[PDB]
Amino acid sequence: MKRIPRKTKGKSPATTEPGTSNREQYKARPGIASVQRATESAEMPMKNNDEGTPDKKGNTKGDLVNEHSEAKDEADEATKKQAKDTDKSKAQVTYSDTGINNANELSRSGNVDNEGGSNQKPMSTRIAEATSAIVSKHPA
């Protein structure tokens, strides 16, 4: 019997035949390590995007910002990261401040819930708010 640990928390005679010698006289071109380093980055799956979705309790995740503002901020973060990877002060490829007037662009954020209402107050808080306005207690 064998067991495998989880990666995520759960609910709880001569033999030297004449062709085996080694003459490592060949250098790959392009180099093996060089290609491996590049493809290592491309292996990685794209990042999760949890924002705007509910949690175990029912309250949505994210930050209370306008959707258009959130999209713009994400574009700026992308440009800054792009500059970071290219080892330059200013990114040559920019996702923000392009020619296109993308003023109607929206991005998913935690400001709005599934009903289309505002998350100024969390879902669970409103549910408790409503359900406690109707309870009754023992007589005097």
């Binding site: 996702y95 392009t98 020619g99 296109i100 993308n102 003023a103 662009e105 929206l106 991005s107």
Partner: peptide, 15 residues
């Protein structure tokens, strides 16, 4: 869906 809100077909990218 949110993808329809882009002015262009996709996310703009400047070169």
């Amino acid at each position: 869906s949110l993808s329809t809100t882009n002015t262009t077909v996709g996310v703009p990218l400047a070169l």
